[PDB]
Design a protein around this ligand. Structure first.
Ligand SMILES: *C(=O)[C@@H](NC(=O)COc1ccccc1)[C@@H]1N[C@@H](C(=O)O)C(C)(C)S1
Length: 442
C-alpha cells in the first residue's frame, strides 16, 4: 500500500478453476462495487435475454383507417432502447404517413408500460440527477435523454446571464443567474446551480463570473415520456399528420395494436460490449430493468431487476450471493454492496463458460480499448494486453475486476475493491507494484 491515509482495500486473486486464492486480503469484506456491478448485469442479461435480444420501439394503431383518417388512437410504445435517436422517431413517423395515415381522430399515447415505478434506482445521490451520466434510464429515451445548453455572461455585470439552447430540444430553460464583476468575492461561495422542475423545465440560479466565451453545459432529461412525446408531436406535425385529441401517457399494460412502424436496437451482445468497454450506465440500467420484466413478466422495476439478477445468479450460474445487495445494473447506487469473494464466483463462472458467453472479449483490454486504454498503473506493471477487466470509479473509489494472464501463461481472476480513497499517483504506484507482482510471480 502506497495508498493515501485511510484507504480501504479488499483484494482477491485466484487462478481460473482453482479452489484457493493466491492473494486473499479482506476478500470476504463487503464493499461498494461501483461500475464493476456491470459484470454481473452483463452475465445475468446474457443468461436471461440472450445475445440476440433487441430493444424495440413501435408505432401502433388501435382502430380503422378510413380515407387516411385513423378512427382511434396512435400508440407510441417505447421499450427502453438506450440507443433510440430523434431520426428513428422521424423515420417511424415517415412510415406511418406512407402506410396511409394522414390524420388521427383520437389521441397520441406515449406508452411506457414496459416499466413501472421510479426511473431512478434507490441510493442514487440526488445531486447528480441532472448530470448526463446519471440521466434517469426511463422506458422513453431519445438521444440518451441528454441535451446541451450554452451559458453566456451578460456584458453588464449585475445583469442576467443568458441561455442558448437548440430549438429542437423540447426543454424549457430559465436563467436567474447574476453576472459577476470578474474579480470580486461573491465568486467564492456563490454557486452556479441547476434546478429541475416539472415537464423538463430547468432554472439556472446563482452567479457566473464574466467570461469571454460561453459556458457549455450538458443536462439530463428528467421526464423522458414528456420529452419523447414532444419530439413525436413535432415529427408528426412536420410530416403533415394532424390529430384531434391530445398527447397522453399510457402506463398500464395493454394489448398491442397493429404495428405500423418499428425500430430495433443492435443485438444485446453488441450493446453489452459497448456497455463494458465504455462503462455505459444507461445501457446497464435499461438492461437491468428489462431483466426483471422478462423473468417475471411484470412491468420492469428496480426491485424486480434486483430479485431477478439474484435468482439468475443462483439458479443458472450456481452463485449464491448471500447478503450481497444489488440495487441497480450500472453500479451507480451507493446501496450496492458485495464482497470480492462473491464477485470472484461470478468471474470464475464467466471464465469457465467463456467459450459459450464470449464474455472476456467484451471487457476493456489494458493498453487497447475502453476504460483501460491507458491505465498508468497497468501500463507501468508491464501488463498491457495481459489484463481484461472492468473498472469501477466513484468519488474515492478505484475498483478493478477481471482477468490477467501471467508470465507463466496462467489465467488468474482478480477483484480489487479500493475505497475510502481521499486526498488531503499513490494508486498508480500501488497498481504498478501489485500487477507486476501478480504477473511476474504466477
Ligand atoms: C461506474 O463506476 C460509473 N461511474 C459513475 O457513474 C460516476 O463516476 C464518477 C463519479 C464521481 C467521481 C468519479 C467518478 C461509470 N464509470 C465511469 C468511468 O469513469 O469509467 C463513468 C464516468 C464513464 S460512468
Amino acid at each position: 500500500t502506497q495508498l493515501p491515509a485511510g484507504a480501504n482495500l479488499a483484494l482477491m486473486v485466484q487462478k481460473v478453476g482453482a479452489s484457493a486464492p493466491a492473494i486473499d486480503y479482506h476478500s470476504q469484506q463487503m464493499a461498494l462495487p461501483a461500475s464493476t456491478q456491470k459484470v454481473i448485469t452483463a452475465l445475468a442479461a446474457l443468461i436471461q435475454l440472450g445475445p440476440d435480444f433487441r430493444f424495440t420501439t413501435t408505432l401502433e394503431t388501435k382502430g380503422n383507417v378510413e380515407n387516411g383518417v385513423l378512427k382511434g388512437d396512435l400508440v407510441a410504445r417505447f421499450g427502453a432502447d438506450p440507443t433510440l435517436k430523434r431520426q428513428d422517431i422521424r423515420n417511424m413517423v415517415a412510415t406511418l404517413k406512407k402506410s396511409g395515415v394522414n390524420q388521427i381522430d383520437g389521441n397520441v399515447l406515449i406508452d411506457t408500460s414496459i416499466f413501472a415505478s421510479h426511473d431512478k434506482a434507490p441510493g442514487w445521490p440526488w445531486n447528480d440527477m441532472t448530470q448526463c451520466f446519471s440521466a434517469p434510464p426511463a422506458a422513453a429515451i431519445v438521444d440518451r435523454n441528454c441535451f446541451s445548453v450554452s451559458l453566456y455572461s451578460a456584458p453588464k455585470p449585475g445583469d442576467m446571464a443568458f441561455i442558448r439552447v437548440a430549438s429542437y430540444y423540447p426543454v424549457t430553460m430559465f436563467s436567474q443567474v447574476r453576472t459577476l464583476p470578474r474579480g470580486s468575492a461573491e465568486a467564492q461561495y456563490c454557486e452556479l446551480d441547476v434546478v429541475p422542475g416539472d415537464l423538463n423545465r430547468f432554472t439556472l440560479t446563482g452567479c457566473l463570473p464574466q467570461r469571454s466565451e460561453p459556458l457549455p453545459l450538458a443536462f439530463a432529461v428528467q421526464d423522458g415520456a414528456s420529452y419523447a412525446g414532444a419530439i413525436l408531436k413535432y415529427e408528426l406535425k412536420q410530416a403533415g399528420i394532424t390529430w384531434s385529441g391530445t398527447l397522453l401517457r399510457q402506463t398500464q399494460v395493454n394489448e398491442p395494436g397493429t404495428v405500423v412502424a418499428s425500430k430495433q436496437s443492435a443485438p444485446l451482445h453488441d450493446l453489452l460490449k459497448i456497455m463494458l468497454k465504455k462503462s455505459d450506465n444507461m445501457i446497464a440500467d435499461t438492461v437491468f430493468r428489462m431483466i426483471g420484466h422478462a423473468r417475471f413478466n411484470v412491468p420492469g422495476t428496480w426491485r424486480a431487476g434486483s430479485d431477478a439478477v439474484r435468482q439468475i445468479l443462483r439458479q443458472q450460474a450456481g452463485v449464491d450471493i448471500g447478503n450481497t445487495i444489488i440495487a441497480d445494473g450500472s453500479g451507480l447506487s451507493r446501496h450496492n454492496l458485495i464482497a470480492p469473494a462473491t464477485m470472484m464466483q461470478v468471474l470464475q463462472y464467466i471464465a469457465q463458460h467463456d467459450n459459450e458467453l464470449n464474455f472476456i472479449s467484451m471487457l476493456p483490454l489494458a493498453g487497447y480499448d475502453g476504460s483501460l486504454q491507458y491505465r498508468a498503473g497497468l501500463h507501468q506493471a508491464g501488463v498491457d494486453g495481459k489484463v481484461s477487466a472492468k473498472t469501477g470509479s466513484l468519488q474515492g473509489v478505484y475498483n478493478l475486476a477481471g482477468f490477467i494472464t501471467t508470465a507463466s501463461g496462467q489465467r488468474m481472476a482478480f477483484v480489487q475493491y479500493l475505497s475510502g480513497y481521499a486526498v488531503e499517483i499513490p494508486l498508480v504506484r500501488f497498481e504498478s507494484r501489485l500487477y507486476k507482482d501478480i504477473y511476474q510471480n504466477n
